[PDB]
Amino acid sequence: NTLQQLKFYKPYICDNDPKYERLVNAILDFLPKIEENLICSKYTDLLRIALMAEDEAIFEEAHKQVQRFDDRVWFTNHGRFHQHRQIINLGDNEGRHAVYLHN
Amino acid sequence: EDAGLIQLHVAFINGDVSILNWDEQDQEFKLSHVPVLKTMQSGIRCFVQVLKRYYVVCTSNCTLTVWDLTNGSSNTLELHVFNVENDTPLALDVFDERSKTATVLLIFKYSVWRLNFLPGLSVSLQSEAVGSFITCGKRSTDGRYLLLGTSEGLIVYDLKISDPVLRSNVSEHIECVDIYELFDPVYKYIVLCGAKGKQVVHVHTLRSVSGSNSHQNREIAWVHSADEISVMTKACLEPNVYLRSLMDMTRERTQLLAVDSKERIHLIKPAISRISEWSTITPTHAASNCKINAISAFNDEQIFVGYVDGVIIDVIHDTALPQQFIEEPIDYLKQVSPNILVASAHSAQKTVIFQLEKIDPLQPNDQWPLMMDVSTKYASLQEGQYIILFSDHGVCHLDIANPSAFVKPKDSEEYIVGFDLKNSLLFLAYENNIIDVFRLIFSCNQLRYEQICEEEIAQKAKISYLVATDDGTMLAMGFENGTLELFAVENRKVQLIYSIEEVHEHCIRQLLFSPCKLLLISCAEQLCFWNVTHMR
C-alpha cells in the first residue's frame, strides 16, 4: 500500500513547481497518516484533512464535486487542527510478536 | 562471556528444576564438560547481576531469592521484601538492567525498584498513580530511560533517570493483549517509534513546552444551551467557547460531569453531589448513604434524578423525595413533563410524580432489562424480549397505560434503537448488517419487494441511535464497535465521516446537534482537539 505509489513520486515530478512539489512532499505525510478502513466507503475525511497544512489549491478545485446535491457528501468535516494523528499505522489486522531491527 | 574474555551466551531453566547453560561463541553449540552446578527448585524471572558469580532468581511466589554460582549454592538474603500481596494473582515482573556497572534496575507492579550492590533496599520510585500489569518497555541507547506504567490503555508513561517527568505522549490510545513493547535507538537523530498490544505503532517527538496531559482529559461533556457550543472535560470545568483557544485548569477530581440547561453549574464530588449557581463553597444537602457514581440535572427546576450505589436519591431546593422501592437504578433520562420514568436493574420501570404520589410505583413487568426512549405522546420501552408502547393519561400523573404495539423480533435481538422527531413512527432494526423502517399500525414485520429501506454495511454489535435531520432521509450515530453511516428511506446515498481516530468511545456517545437548526457537529474520543465542523 504505497512504495509503488511512492515510487511513482520520484520520477513523475518531471515538470512541476514548488506548489505541486511541496504538495506531494506534504502528501507523503498522509501516506502513513491515512488509515485503512472500510475502503472508499468512508472516503470522506481524507479530502478535508488534506487541508490540515495547506499549500494546496486542490480542495478549492474540488469545489465542482464535493458539494454536489444530496447524493454525495455535503460541506462538513472542517477540521483545521482537529483529529490529531500524524499516524503511520494503517493496519487493523492480527499480530502476536514484534520488535525493531538493531540497524 | 566466561570463556574467551566475543559474544553473549544463553541460559535457562527446564522442568528438570536444574539450571541449563549454553556456550556459543561462533556458529553451533558446544556444551563443554559439566554444568558444574545446578539450581534448587525453579523460578520465573532469572538474570545475571553485574558480577558473573551471582544470579538473581525470581519465582512465581513473588519473593526474592538467590543461588550463588560460586562459593556454595544457597547462601543468604531472603530477608525484607516490600509487599507479598499482589493486586491480582500473577507471577513476578520483568527484571531489567542499567548502563552502570553497579546500579541495577527492577520493576514490581505499580512500583519501580532501583537496586545496587550490597544486599538491597536502595532506591524506590513511582511516576504517579493509575488493570493488571503485563506489558513493559525499555531503552538502551536513549540513555536507559525506563518505559513503564500501572495499566495505561491511554498515554503510556516514560520515566527519565532520577527525575519524575513525562516527555512522552500517546494520541493513538492502545489496547492490551501481549507484553511486547520497545523503542528504536534512532541512530543519532531523535524521535521515537514503538509497537504494542493493539498491533499498531506509535510515533512521537519528545520536543514540547509542557507535559502532564494524562489526568486532565479522559471523557468529554457539553454545556446544554440554545445555539451555543461549550464543551467540558475531565477535572470538572475547563472553560471553552466558539473559536477561542483559551483554556483553564482546575481539578476538584470529579467522577462524571453533567450540565444543567442554564448557566447554573451541576457537578459531583467524591461521595456526594453538588448543585450551585457558581462554585465557591458549593452548598448542598443529601440523605445519600454511600458514594454516587453519576448525577445529572433536568431542564426544568423540578426535582432531580441519578443512579447511586444505593437506594437513596438526593435532590436540592425541592421537597418530596422519590418513593424508591428499588434495589439500584441503572438508566436515567430527562423530560420536561412533571412525570419522569426511570429504568431499573430489576427491570421494573418507576413513575416519579413531582411533589406528590397518590399512586404506587410498582410495575415488575419482566426480569429482562429495560431501556427506553420517547417520541411525543408515547413512552417507548425496549426490553430484552420485546418492545412495548404506553399511552400517557396525563403529564401530571401516570396511573394506567394502554398497550399499542408489541412484537417478538428475530433471535439475537438488537440492544438499543432510536426514533426521529416530528414523525413518531415504528422502527425496528436487527443488529447485524440490516436495518428496517416500519409503519406504526399494530405491528409490521413485512418488507419484501414493495420497497427497499436503507442498508447496513458495517455495524454488528452495540447499535446505538438515530435522529431527525435536514430534508434528505435520516441520520444514525455512535462510534461504539464501528462507525456511523447515512442511508436513504427509499434509496441509497452517501454516508458521513469516520469515527474520529481512537476506538473505545467514551461513556456518552450522544452527538451535539439542533435537529432543524443543525450547523456544528462535535465528536471526539479522548485527547482529540476542537471538534467544530460546520456548513456554508
XYZ file of C-alpha atoms in Angstrom:
639
model
C 0.000 0.000 0.000
C 2.334 2.743 -1.410
C 6.042 2.333 -2.287
C 4.718 1.762 -5.781
C 2.753 4.895 -5.198
C 5.789 6.395 -3.542
C 7.973 5.007 -6.302
C 5.879 6.945 -8.793
C 6.566 10.107 -6.921
C 10.283 10.435 -7.556
C 10.211 10.237 -11.388
C 6.881 11.796 -12.208
C 7.598 15.270 -10.802
C 9.270 15.775 -14.183
C 7.603 19.136 -14.931
C 6.260 20.957 -11.856
C 6.892 23.835 -9.458
C 7.232 24.154 -5.650
C 3.444 24.397 -5.489
C 2.908 20.887 -6.794
C 6.248 19.654 -5.457
C 5.731 20.511 -1.809
C 2.107 19.475 -2.297
C 3.307 15.919 -2.910
C 6.118 16.290 -0.388
C 3.333 17.043 2.001
C 1.002 14.320 0.730
C 3.804 11.947 1.569
C 2.576 12.645 5.100
C -0.936 11.295 4.548
C 0.581 8.116 3.224
C 1.438 6.784 6.661
C -1.105 9.141 8.110
C -4.012 7.764 6.098
C -5.870 4.921 7.772
C -7.183 1.731 6.300
C -10.860 1.478 6.857
C -13.900 0.401 5.055
C -12.286 1.165 1.742
C -13.631 4.268 -0.015
C -16.792 3.592 1.888
C -15.708 6.269 4.161
C -13.628 8.066 1.638
C -14.982 11.228 3.242
C -12.227 12.663 6.000
C -9.328 12.378 3.514
C -10.493 15.298 1.354
C -10.806 17.818 4.180
C -7.817 16.586 6.207
C -5.750 17.178 3.096
C -6.274 20.805 4.142
C -4.663 20.454 7.598
C -1.422 22.047 6.457
C -2.465 23.724 3.229
C -0.136 24.808 0.463
C -2.705 23.219 -1.820
C -5.480 24.616 -4.014
C -6.709 21.040 -4.542
C -9.872 21.125 -2.422
C -10.694 24.512 -3.939
C -10.628 22.714 -7.286
C -12.781 20.029 -5.659
C -15.493 22.684 -5.324
C -17.031 21.265 -8.511
C -17.506 17.831 -6.935
C -17.569 17.729 -3.101
C -20.660 19.973 -2.904
C -22.954 18.056 -5.259
C -26.622 17.806 -4.226
C -27.753 15.393 -1.510
C -26.292 12.398 -3.344
C -22.599 12.546 -2.496
C -21.152 14.420 0.506
C -22.169 17.883 1.700
C -19.938 20.540 3.269
C -18.837 19.263 6.700
C -15.750 17.737 8.251
C -13.969 21.116 8.510
C -11.182 20.330 10.987
C -8.313 22.844 10.833
C -6.406 21.428 13.815
C -8.700 18.502 14.560
C -8.344 14.698 14.764
C -4.595 14.950 15.582
C -2.924 11.803 14.135
C 0.187 12.082 12.001
C -0.196 8.338 12.472
C 1.788 5.828 10.405
C -0.183 2.609 11.045
C -2.930 1.729 8.560
C -3.448 -1.909 9.541
C -6.267 -3.316 11.659
C -5.014 -6.890 11.376
C -3.858 -9.520 13.876
C -0.376 -9.992 15.320
C 1.466 -11.692 18.177
C 5.152 -10.773 18.452
C 7.109 -7.812 17.090
C 10.301 -5.758 17.532
C 12.665 -3.397 15.663
C 15.914 -4.269 13.898
C 19.059 -3.030 15.659
C 20.314 -1.372 12.467
C 31.464 -14.358 28.157
C 33.035 -16.733 30.681
C 35.284 -18.415 28.112
C 37.051 -16.002 25.770
C 37.016 -12.908 27.970
C 33.219 -12.113 21.653
C 29.531 -12.903 22.200
C 26.844 -13.258 24.882
C 25.790 -16.758 25.936
C 22.285 -18.065 26.642
C 20.992 -19.918 29.707
C 17.612 -21.021 31.066
C 15.817 -23.490 33.345
C 13.783 -26.513 32.233
C 11.167 -28.515 34.126
C 14.050 -30.594 35.465
C 14.455 -27.997 38.261
C 18.121 -27.572 37.330
C 19.997 -24.725 35.638
C 20.935 -25.158 31.971
C 23.751 -23.230 30.292
C 24.627 -22.895 26.601
C 28.075 -21.865 25.376
C 28.045 -20.272 21.920
C 30.976 -18.265 20.562
C 30.728 -18.894 16.798
C 28.144 -20.996 14.946
C 26.934 -24.223 16.559
C 26.513 -25.035 20.252
C 29.324 -26.637 22.251
C 28.270 -27.581 25.797
C 31.766 -28.099 27.196
C 32.002 -30.670 30.006
C 29.696 -30.377 33.022
C 27.230 -27.619 34.049
C 29.426 -27.526 37.199
C 26.336 -26.888 39.376
C 22.524 -26.876 39.488
C 19.785 -24.649 40.922
C 17.288 -25.546 43.655
C 13.633 -25.723 42.565
C 12.620 -23.265 39.841
C 11.946 -19.552 39.405
C 10.295 -17.435 36.724
C 12.427 -14.325 36.078
C 16.154 -15.047 36.365
C 19.107 -12.953 35.218
C 22.795 -12.219 35.903
C 23.972 -9.318 38.082
C 26.889 -7.000 37.332
C 29.037 -9.818 38.720
C 29.152 -13.143 36.872
C 29.384 -15.002 40.188
C 25.831 -14.118 41.247
C 22.442 -14.777 39.635
C 19.187 -13.123 40.709
C 16.262 -15.545 40.753
C 12.572 -14.668 40.955
C 9.806 -17.235 41.435
C 6.037 -17.229 40.908
C 5.558 -16.596 44.630
C 6.783 -13.016 44.134
C 9.721 -13.469 46.505
C 13.395 -12.525 46.230
C 15.775 -15.491 46.354
C 19.331 -16.115 45.167
C 21.569 -19.100 44.425
C 25.257 -18.224 44.134
C 27.222 -19.640 41.200
C 30.454 -19.884 43.179
C 31.062 -20.250 46.929
C 28.307 -22.790 47.560
C 24.792 -22.627 46.129
C 22.245 -21.194 48.566
C 23.730 -18.641 50.954
C 21.623 -15.814 52.383
C 19.447 -12.708 51.971
C 15.863 -13.930 51.733
C 15.015 -11.011 54.015
C 12.894 -7.863 53.695
C 10.528 -7.991 50.730
C 8.265 -4.935 50.455
C 4.904 -6.468 49.530
C 3.893 -10.127 49.299
C 0.285 -9.228 48.481
C -0.478 -8.735 44.790
C -3.409 -6.690 43.488
C -4.207 -9.528 41.083
C -2.705 -13.039 41.122
C 0.293 -13.224 38.765
C 3.996 -14.025 38.568
C 6.865 -11.648 39.328
C 7.573 -8.933 36.753
C 10.470 -8.492 34.324
C 13.942 -7.805 35.733
C 15.980 -5.106 33.972
C 19.450 -3.559 33.634
C 21.196 -0.183 33.663
C 24.174 1.370 31.881
C 26.058 1.473 35.181
C 28.460 -1.261 36.287
C 26.940 -1.235 39.777
C 23.380 0.115 39.953
C 20.798 -2.270 38.502
C 17.103 -1.969 37.663
C 13.889 -3.789 38.579
C 10.140 -3.156 38.416
C 7.359 -4.657 40.529
C 3.694 -3.964 39.734
C 2.888 -0.296 40.361
C 6.297 0.414 41.906
C 9.813 0.668 40.485
C 12.741 -0.817 42.395
C 16.194 0.558 41.577
C 18.875 -1.596 43.177
C 22.594 -1.591 43.960
C 25.494 -3.661 45.281
C 25.128 -4.715 48.947
C 22.029 -6.755 49.990
C 19.422 -4.228 48.832
C 16.730 -1.697 49.722
C 18.291 1.244 47.892
C 16.005 3.215 45.582
C 12.211 3.069 45.247
C 10.439 5.273 42.701
C 6.950 5.794 41.279
C 5.965 8.137 38.447
C 2.338 8.567 39.533
C -0.893 6.749 40.385
C -3.185 4.882 37.988
C -5.861 -3.321 35.482
C -3.197 -5.997 35.843
C 0.427 -5.300 34.916
C 1.593 -7.234 31.856
C 3.439 -5.225 29.173
C 6.528 -3.082 29.756
C 9.141 -1.320 27.637
C 12.835 -0.478 27.968
C 15.603 1.654 26.418
C 19.355 1.355 25.824
C 20.994 3.944 23.559
C 18.367 6.530 24.530
C 20.117 6.932 27.886
C 18.454 3.986 29.627
C 15.124 5.660 30.405
C 12.528 3.191 31.666
C 9.171 2.807 29.914
C 6.543 1.839 32.491
C 3.085 2.227 33.999
C 0.231 0.722 36.011
C -2.054 -0.241 33.115
C -2.339 2.774 30.814
C -4.708 1.899 27.996
C -4.063 5.563 27.252
C -0.864 7.645 27.429
C 1.869 5.104 28.210
C 4.403 6.622 30.619
C 8.175 7.021 30.307
C 10.498 7.559 33.271
C 13.694 9.597 32.962
C 16.570 8.747 35.316
C 16.261 10.246 38.823
C 13.577 12.706 37.673
C 9.748 12.471 37.696
C 8.980 13.980 34.281
C 6.967 12.695 31.308
C 8.317 13.642 27.877
C 6.168 11.090 26.040
C 2.564 11.303 24.836
C 0.122 8.859 23.239
C -2.622 10.136 20.931
C -3.249 6.685 19.439
C -4.627 5.262 22.704
C -3.955 1.469 22.814
C -5.493 -1.916 23.654
C -4.000 -4.577 25.956
C -3.181 -8.171 24.993
C 0.543 -9.063 24.912
C 3.798 -7.990 26.552
C 5.760 -6.725 23.539
C 6.980 -3.121 23.642
C 10.269 -1.340 22.816
C 11.781 1.790 21.237
C 14.362 2.191 18.460
C 17.788 3.666 19.212
C 17.316 6.289 16.451
C 20.966 6.160 15.282
C 21.971 9.727 16.113
C 18.849 11.807 15.346
C 15.986 11.741 17.857
C 12.324 10.691 17.550
C 10.595 7.526 18.766
C 8.544 4.630 17.418
C 7.159 1.538 19.155
C 4.714 -1.375 18.954
C 2.096 -2.572 21.463
C -0.925 -4.826 22.031
C -3.316 -3.227 19.520
C -0.819 -4.398 16.880
C -0.034 -0.839 15.849
C 2.876 1.587 16.052
C 3.223 4.874 17.944
C 5.441 7.659 16.608
C 6.282 10.568 18.906
C 8.616 13.553 19.286
C 9.681 14.462 22.830
C 10.029 18.148 21.940
C 7.270 20.233 23.553
C 6.604 23.057 26.014
C 4.619 21.200 28.691
C 3.608 17.687 29.719
C 1.110 16.295 32.241
C -1.830 15.876 29.860
C -2.627 12.498 31.432
C -5.368 13.079 34.005
C -6.645 16.400 32.651
C -8.542 14.841 29.736
C -10.327 11.490 29.560
C -14.016 11.934 28.638
C -15.885 14.898 27.152
C -19.149 16.563 28.175
C -21.028 19.574 26.803
C -22.960 22.555 28.144
C -26.673 22.392 27.346
C -27.927 25.626 25.785
C -29.608 27.210 22.765
C -27.364 27.592 19.702
C -24.298 27.903 21.939
C -21.423 25.415 21.973
C -19.434 24.984 25.183
C -17.546 21.757 25.879
C -16.213 20.407 29.174
C -13.617 17.782 30.110
C -12.142 15.758 32.980
C -11.190 17.702 36.136
C -14.604 19.416 36.143
C -14.994 22.754 34.394
C -12.448 23.811 31.797
C -13.790 26.929 30.034
C -14.217 26.586 26.265
C -16.104 28.739 23.753
C -16.581 29.035 19.987
C -13.352 29.835 18.096
C -11.273 30.508 21.218
C -8.089 28.786 22.393
C -8.482 29.991 25.986
C -8.093 27.117 28.456
C -8.022 26.967 32.261
C -7.114 24.055 34.538
C -8.721 23.377 37.920
C -9.228 19.906 39.393
C -11.732 19.110 42.141
C -11.497 15.475 40.993
C -14.994 14.854 39.615
C -16.231 11.395 38.635
C -18.763 12.090 35.876
C -19.807 15.618 34.910
C -23.269 16.737 33.793
C -24.594 20.176 32.837
C -27.874 21.959 33.621
C -29.984 23.700 30.955
C -28.987 27.165 32.159
C -25.601 28.640 33.088
C -26.064 27.063 36.528
C -23.323 24.564 37.372
C -24.188 20.984 38.297
C -21.282 18.841 39.495
C -20.146 15.844 41.535
C -17.740 15.441 44.454
C -16.390 12.158 45.825
C -19.150 10.574 47.922
C -21.631 13.438 47.286
C -23.452 15.537 44.655
C -23.385 19.330 44.339
C -25.658 21.895 42.667
C -24.665 25.561 42.542
C -25.021 28.870 40.701
C -21.252 29.276 40.691
C -18.738 27.190 42.649
C -17.106 28.559 45.790
C -18.283 26.748 48.919
C -20.706 24.687 46.798
C -23.663 24.363 49.227
C -25.758 21.162 49.186
C -27.659 18.606 51.273
C -28.139 14.869 50.737
C -29.527 11.833 52.559
C -27.413 9.540 50.360
C -25.970 6.515 52.163
C -22.886 5.960 50.004
C -20.806 7.297 47.112
C -22.663 8.226 43.925
C -21.352 7.075 40.539
C -23.055 9.701 38.377
C -25.522 12.566 38.779
C -27.443 14.685 36.255
C -29.816 17.653 36.032
C -33.085 18.289 34.184
C -34.017 21.302 32.086
C -36.829 22.435 34.376
C -36.115 23.005 38.077
C -38.368 20.115 39.144
C -36.619 17.567 41.428
C -33.597 15.602 40.023
C -32.548 12.044 39.121
C -29.426 9.885 39.150
C -28.058 6.433 39.909
C -26.243 5.976 43.216
C -24.525 2.904 44.720
C -27.606 2.639 46.928
C -31.324 3.293 47.345
C -31.380 6.964 48.391
C -31.534 9.510 45.558
C -30.712 13.087 46.580
C -32.376 16.300 45.381
C -31.953 20.006 46.164
C -34.267 23.032 46.581
C -37.225 20.642 46.274
C -39.169 18.561 48.795
C -40.990 15.233 48.356
C -38.186 12.693 47.909
C -38.806 9.846 45.413
C -40.670 6.717 46.545
C -37.832 4.341 45.580
C -38.733 0.692 46.279
C -35.926 -0.474 44.002
C -32.569 -2.158 44.634
C -30.315 0.046 42.467
C -31.080 2.303 39.433
C -29.381 1.982 36.024
C -30.720 4.128 33.149
C -31.926 7.691 33.715
C -33.191 10.392 31.333
C -34.546 13.938 31.053
C -38.124 15.093 30.444
C -39.887 18.461 30.568
C -43.029 16.695 31.783
C -43.884 16.654 35.527
C -43.705 12.844 35.483
C -40.412 11.012 34.947
C -39.968 7.345 34.027
C -36.835 5.661 35.383
C -35.344 2.316 34.324
C -34.038 -0.131 36.930
C -31.645 -3.062 37.367
C -34.591 -5.193 38.487
C -36.103 -4.093 35.151
C -39.137 -2.511 36.793
C -39.843 0.970 35.431
C -40.592 3.650 38.021
C -43.055 6.522 37.674
C -41.870 9.637 39.504
C -44.533 12.283 40.119
C -43.458 15.783 41.157
C -44.254 16.900 44.709
C -46.937 14.192 45.099
C -47.610 10.463 44.655
C -51.229 9.314 45.083
C -50.237 6.088 43.248
C -47.978 3.060 43.849
C -44.890 2.935 41.575
C -44.735 -0.873 41.433
C -44.529 -2.368 37.934
C -42.493 -5.614 37.793
C -43.213 -6.417 34.129
C -40.263 -8.645 33.196
C -36.861 -9.681 34.544
C -35.248 -8.762 31.225
C -33.506 -5.346 31.476
C -35.370 -2.258 30.239
C -34.069 0.674 28.216
C -36.463 3.337 26.984
C -36.977 6.237 24.588
C -39.876 8.600 23.868
C -41.324 10.297 20.780
C -44.237 12.569 21.692
C -47.302 11.066 23.380
C -45.948 7.518 23.561
C -43.500 6.001 26.031
C -41.274 3.530 24.189
C -39.985 0.607 26.249
C -37.295 -1.575 24.690
C -36.811 -4.763 26.706
C -34.584 -7.814 26.356
C -37.609 -9.590 24.907
C -39.974 -7.232 23.090
C -40.803 -3.550 22.611
C -43.942 -2.162 24.252
C -45.586 1.262 23.919
C -47.520 3.138 26.607
C -50.105 5.899 26.252
C -49.800 8.618 28.895
C -53.088 9.516 30.579
C -51.683 12.824 31.797
C -48.434 14.730 32.258
C -49.223 15.386 35.923
C -49.677 11.756 36.963
C -49.414 8.350 35.291
C -51.687 5.560 36.522
C -52.868 3.332 33.657
C -51.011 2.563 30.427
C -52.719 1.272 27.283
C -50.650 -1.181 25.188
C -50.372 -0.446 21.461
C -47.502 -2.104 19.592
C -45.788 -5.244 20.881
C -43.960 -7.903 18.862
C -41.249 -10.533 19.389
C -38.339 -9.875 16.978
C -35.764 -12.254 15.484
C -33.203 -14.163 17.563
C -30.116 -12.268 18.774
C -32.140 -9.107 19.347
C -30.857 -5.543 18.997
C -29.639 -3.756 22.128
C -30.988 -0.236 21.593
C -32.535 1.839 18.792
C -33.740 5.407 18.291
C -36.564 7.497 16.838
C -36.874 10.694 14.799
C -38.611 13.981 15.612
C -41.916 15.367 14.292
C -42.563 11.889 12.885
C -43.289 9.321 15.608
C -43.256 6.098 13.590
C -42.355 2.464 14.270
C -38.714 1.481 13.786
C -37.175 -1.937 14.416
C -33.706 -2.823 13.134
C -31.831 -6.105 13.557
C -28.297 -5.801 14.932
C -26.312 -7.471 12.142
C -25.954 -5.862 8.712
C -29.617 -4.922 8.251
C -31.915 -2.051 9.259
C -35.648 -1.754 8.601
C -38.138 1.119 8.733
C -41.709 0.156 9.626
C -45.163 1.718 9.916
C -46.880 2.318 13.261
C -50.228 0.478 12.828
C -50.304 -2.549 15.141
C -47.169 -4.410 14.059
C -45.420 -4.842 10.706
C -42.563 -7.253 10.027
C -43.270 -7.144 6.293
C -40.899 -5.557 3.777
C -40.488 -7.892 0.788
C -40.241 -6.450 -2.729
C -42.514 -3.459 -2.069
C -39.790 -1.003 -1.070
C -36.132 -1.068 -0.033
C -35.348 0.631 3.276
C -31.766 1.896 3.647
C -28.964 -0.676 4.202
C -26.397 -1.682 6.811
C -22.887 -2.473 5.551
C -20.885 -2.283 8.786
C -22.435 -2.302 12.261
C -22.875 -5.638 14.035
C -22.730 -5.285 17.838
C -23.876 -2.361 20.004
C -26.055 -0.442 17.542
C -26.717 2.956 19.101
C -29.179 5.576 17.855
C -30.580 7.811 15.119
C -32.388 11.163 14.906
C -34.333 13.601 12.748
C -32.285 15.727 10.356
C -32.411 18.093 7.378
C -34.506 17.342 4.259
C -32.824 14.190 2.947
C -33.599 10.952 4.836
C -32.384 10.454 8.439
C -29.053 10.136 10.267
C -27.699 7.495 12.670
C -24.772 7.846 15.077
C -22.280 6.450 17.589
C -18.671 5.266 17.436
C -19.082 2.117 19.534
C -17.787 -1.090 17.920
C -17.813 0.543 14.493
C -18.745 3.784 12.762
C -21.835 5.839 11.922
C -23.456 5.779 8.485
C -26.086 7.556 6.375
C -28.707 5.956 4.126
C -31.964 6.898 2.393
C -35.503 5.682 3.093
C -36.430 4.686 -0.466
C -32.873 4.649 -1.846
C -29.162 4.503 -1.027
C -26.937 7.549 -0.507
C -23.572 8.764 0.798
C -22.525 8.264 4.429
C -20.828 10.560 6.955
C -17.333 10.780 8.448
C -15.244 8.084 10.148
C -15.051 7.563 13.866
C -12.531 10.306 14.647
C -9.392 8.317 15.455
C -9.360 6.110 18.538
C -11.573 3.161 19.426
C -13.323 2.576 22.765
C -15.717 5.535 22.678
C -16.296 7.413 25.945
C -19.333 6.661 28.131
C -21.595 9.245 26.483
C -21.933 8.539 22.758
C -24.523 11.279 22.225
C -23.912 13.742 19.382
C -24.263 17.508 19.727
C -26.909 18.971 17.412
C -30.071 21.011 16.954
C -32.457 18.956 14.801
C -33.722 21.591 12.330
C -31.012 24.120 13.207
C -28.052 21.785 12.645
C -24.783 23.514 11.792
C -21.967 22.357 14.076
C -21.132 18.695 14.704
C -18.866 17.644 17.579
C -17.301 14.197 18.011
C -14.199 13.019 19.897
C -12.811 10.110 21.919
C -10.107 11.055 24.423
C -7.310 13.521 23.642
C -8.867 14.910 20.442
C -8.817 18.667 19.793
C -11.663 21.074 18.970
C -14.455 19.218 17.188
C -16.081 22.124 15.349
C -17.349 21.318 11.847
C -19.930 23.432 10.023
C -21.590 24.020 6.655
C -21.703 27.083 4.402
